[PDB]
């Protein structure tokens, strides 16, 4: 799965509404409406594509066929998850085989980790010794996508965000404009999302 780093920019989260009617748009820890009124330090964005029914598995505190070995959200995650249908864009009439899914591995993974090893899964009692065969399976498999399939198997594009919440010099937030500075009077103030009243 691919990830991207975003910093030193002015955001505008309303434009996301320009898209088609979504299938999943949820957030944990922050109400999505007022996202424009908070400033952030660094932004990490992950993207990938999942089968239609298994989009539910992108959720904290649950297990599944992907959460076991591929993508593991920490139990204290705060951020937003977006998922929208892609049958219109990622299907060939002849059937497309260019998407890989993990099937077997010894044990689960800690959150925010990756593994692309090609070691053979020793399912059987015999020592495979690096030889493919019976009870020595190839770790990866391929999905299928046809335009006439049902919505239950149509492809879905999913993106995950992540936040940091003002624990450092912030770099990214909305287009709110500044003003001149006044002191020695009783004034209401707002510094980087920290609001207060008093005298400076």
């Amino acid at each position, epitope marked *: 799965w691919n990830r991207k780093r975003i910093s030193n920019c002015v955001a505008d989260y309303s434009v996301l509404y320009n898209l088609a009617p979504f299938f999943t748009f949820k957030c944990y820890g922050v109400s999505p409406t007022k996202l424009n009124d908070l400033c952030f330090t660094n932004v990490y964005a992950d993207s990938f594509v999942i089968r239609g029914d298994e989009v539910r598995q992108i959720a904290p505190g649950q297990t599944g066929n992907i959460a076991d070995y591929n993508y593991k959200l920490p139990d204290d995650f705060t951020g937003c998850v977006i998922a929208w249908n892609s049958n219109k864009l*990622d299907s060939k009439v002849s059937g497309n085989y*260019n998407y890989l899914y993990r099937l077997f591995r010894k044990s689960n993974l800690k959150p925010f980790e990756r593994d692309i090893s090609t070691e053979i899964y020793q399912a059987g009692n015999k020592p495979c010794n690096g030889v493919a065969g019976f009870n020595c399976y190839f770790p990866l498999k391929s999905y299928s996508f046809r335009p006439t399939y049902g919505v239950g198997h149509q492809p879905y594009r999913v993106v995950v965000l992540s936040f940091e919440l003002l624990h450092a010099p912030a770099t990214v937030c909305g287009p709110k404009k500044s003003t001149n500075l006044v002191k020695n009077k009783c004034v209401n103030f707002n510094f980087n999302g920290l609001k207060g009243t008093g005298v400076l």
Partner: antibody
Amino acid sequence: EVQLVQSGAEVKKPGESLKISCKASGYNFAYYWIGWVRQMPGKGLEWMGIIYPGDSDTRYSPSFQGQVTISADKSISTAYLQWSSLKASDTAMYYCARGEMTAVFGDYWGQGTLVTVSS
Amino acid sequence: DIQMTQSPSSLSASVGDRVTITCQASQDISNYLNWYQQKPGKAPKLLIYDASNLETGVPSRFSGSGSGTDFTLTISSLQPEDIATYYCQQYKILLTWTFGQGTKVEIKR
């Protein structure tokens, strides 16, 4: 067996309107994409826009947003390229092509259509 | 914005020779390239639709490779039936598309 058919050439004068059409058959028409390309003599090629007639959706280039219109009919399996107003610097050849997003474009192309406008 | 460059603008050679051509970019674009051939006439044709993958229905005198921003195409054995135009183009945005500049070939006799 896939074929493309176009409307004929055309000459007109500034201040008017015009429409062009492109038609194909030999496959399930609703499951592919159509695109337009402009080419004016002495220069290179330059993309204009695409469409997915199966479910009406349009996209446009940064250099031609809000200038030309694209649509299609799935009943007769045809795509329409339509204008609103004409000016003096739009003389060039136009191409309609059929493409597929995942793997390849331009596996086939039309025979090419011409336009001329002057006073 | 994304901008291409081709090199050289033109060249000429004779039969039974190796020929090469280069296409360059201002930033890495992760092997989403393709090449188009268009002989003087009507229809541009697709020749190579990936970094090193060729469309079916074309003999095996063509090759090419590249990554990052360095990309080369070549023909091992020139044949007299090859007089046309060539271009390289790219794609990473859903719609931000552009072709290159142009390469000219001429034969020796």
